[PDB]
Design a protein around this ligand. Sequence first.
Ligand SMILES: N[C@@H](CCC(=O)O)C(=O)O
Lengths: 49, 50
Amino acid sequence: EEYVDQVSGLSDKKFQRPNDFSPPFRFGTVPNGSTERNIRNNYAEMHAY
Amino acid sequence: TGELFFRSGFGIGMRKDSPWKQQVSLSILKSHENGFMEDLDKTWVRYQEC
Ligand SMILES: N[C@@H](CCC(=O)O)C(=O)O
């Protein structure tokens, strides 16, 4: 047999609507970088979460 | 079969005394941060039929 991934990427439902499930998915990053600037310009609610 | 070697990417060739050589490099980096080149990748390069 072969396992499968839990998510499909940054465009998954768990990253866009975390409150619509079980106790919410916990994801974060370290600020003051380039990934934070990339996420902030493309996703606002996800950036705040 | 095998791994990758001589990893180099594709580019747009332009002559040295070209006025457009600065505005093209600022448009490719801008299309990599807004998701413009991933629509072009999933449309022509990524329907894996078999
Ligand atoms: N390489 C990033 C920092 C590390 C990261 O954001 O993943 C920068 O120079 O801003």
